[PDB]
Write a protein that binds this ligand. Structure first.
Ligand SMILES: *C(=O)N1C[C@H](NOS(=O)(=O)O)CC[C@H]1C(=O)NNC(=O)[C@@H]1CCNC1
Ligand SMILES: [Cl-]
Length: 458
């Protein structure tokens, strides 16, 4: 008599080879094991028993003897590769393909530590390679409770908590990116030619389009005076980008911010990534069926309105500013079966008509943290490396979310981080120190100094 044999699920490693997912022996068959538990619930995901629906959507041959299936995260997206082929009693089953993740969990743990128990999300990207060095969504849960079947009570402890431990804030958490988009908006205006690196704008504390008497007010009521590209970035002036978005138009704004990855998903291998929203004139005609008003473009110049962005879309934009426009999609899976995965649908690189604008916007982001009048100047006083970042706030009872993106070292980008702290208020005061703690753990040795590898200038 012949009898089928199930295959063993592929092992999951981090970027340094620490095991993220084993298989443990049980009797009356292997169970999947997550030896780091909550530190990867939203990155790797988990597996569970196979339901009524997914059984009529799986090979009865290859999945014979396989009673569990990927549910979310990496286990699902690469369920095919991690599964394998069955054997027969001896045709031996070929074990599932092993996956090496890009995440360094010495940075994943340091990021969760930097979040300090607050609800939110942290995403770290290596801009030259696209490796997702960290993917953090707080709070967490133990993925080892669904592998065997989770008690309908313990599920409720997850489901009926208002902190939402099941919410993957990195992938399905959509927030108005706020002031953090202003570097990309500046590049949109600089590219079109409506604004030049030295062209000035007087800030009386408000902006009016040449038709209405209505005033679009600056976050500083009394104004910043004459502001240029750099002054507009390290002070995050709203009137400068009110004026920039006006002279640019939403037709060429939505097109530019789309090439930065806003609108649809950015990553290569992230299950259930929300597209986000980059509003255009065609969207509002479909969705709301009303003509686009020129006042709706000005709120977009400072990252507001109906615009929706996921914390990974933000981090990819941060890596893009670090990468000088070379488009490489973020990806968790570093290698599959020992070779890196290939992007089937790449994104075109962002080729500016004056490539020096990259260094000018980066220098504006650079003075955000280190300038004498930067919003996050206190963060730069405690730094051993140059940080080209920018703080912001998201729009929302309770307060509003604090945001801060940034890459470092500014002159040789090795890390790109985007942080969203729920109800943090001060992008400069809470979200900025979290980036610097995440960036510190990646760049600093264990004695507080910058690593030898990253110090040399290029
Ligand atoms: C961007 O989101 N803004 C710029 C400020 N810089 O962030 S931080 O606090 O330095 O870290 C933060 C506030 C936010 C802002 O409010 N910008 N201005 C507006 O939204 C209009 C002025 C008041 N009504 C809207
Ligand atoms: Cl200030």
């Amino acid at each position: 008599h012949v009898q089928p044999i199930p295959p063993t699920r592929g092992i999951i490693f981090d970027r340094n080879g620490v095991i993220i997912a084993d298989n443990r022996p049980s009797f009356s068959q292997f169970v999947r094991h997550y030896p780091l538990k909550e530190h990867f619930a939203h990155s790797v995901g988990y597996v569970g028993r196979i339901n009524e629906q997914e059984l009529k959507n799986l090979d009865p041959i290859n999945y014979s003897g396989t009673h569990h299936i990927g549910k979310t995260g990496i286990e699902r997206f690469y369920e095919s590769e991690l599964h394998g082929t069955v054997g027969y009693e001896r045709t031996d089953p070929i074990p599932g393909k092993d996956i090496v993740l890009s995440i360094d969990s010495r940075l994943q743990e340091a990021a969760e530590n930097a979040l300090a128990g607050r609800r939110g999300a942290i995403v770290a990207i290596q801009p030259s390679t696209g490796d997702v060095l960290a993917m953090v969504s707080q709070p967490s849960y133990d993925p080892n409770l669904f592998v065997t079947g989770i008690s309908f009570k313990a599920y409720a402890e997850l489901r009926d908590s208002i902190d939402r431990p099941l919410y993957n804030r990195v992938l399905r958490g959509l927030y108005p990116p706020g002031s953090t988009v202003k570097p990309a908006v500046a590049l949109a205006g600089l590219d079109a030619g409506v604004v030049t690196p030295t062209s000035r704008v007087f800030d009386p504390g408000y902006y009016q389009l040449p038709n209405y008497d209505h005033k679009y007010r600056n976050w500083n009521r009394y104004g910043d005076g004459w502001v240029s590209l750099e002054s507009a970035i390290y002070r995050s002036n709203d009137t400068y980008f009110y004026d920039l978005a006006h002279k640019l138009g939403i037709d060429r704004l939505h097109a530019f911010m789309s090439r930065f990855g806003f609108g649809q998903k950015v990553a290569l291998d992230m299950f259930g990534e929300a597209d986000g929203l980059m509003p255009s004139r065609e969207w509002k005609r479909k969705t709301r069926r009303q003509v686009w008003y020129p006042g709706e473009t000005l709120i977009l110049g400072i990252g507001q309105g109906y615009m929706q962005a996921t914390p990974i879309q933000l981090a990819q934009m941060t890596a893009l500013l670090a990468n000088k426009g070379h488009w490489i999609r973020p990806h968790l899976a570093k290698t599959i079966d020992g070779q890196p995965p290939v992007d089937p649908d790449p994104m075109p690189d962002i080729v500016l008509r004056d490539p020096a604008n990259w260094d000018r916007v980066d220098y504006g982001m650079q003075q955000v943290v280190h300038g004498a009048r930067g919003t996050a100047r206190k963060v730069g006083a405690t730094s051993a490396y140059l940080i080209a970042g920018k703080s912001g706030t998201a729009q929302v009872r309770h307060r509003d979310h604090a945001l801060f993106v940034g890459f470092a070292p500014a002159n040789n980008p090795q890390i790109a981080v985007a942080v969203m702290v729920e109800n943090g208020e001060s992008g400069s005061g809470v979200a900025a120190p979290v980036v610097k703690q995440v960036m510190d753990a990646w760049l600093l040795d264990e004695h507080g100094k910058l690593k030898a590898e990253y110090a040399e200038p290029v």
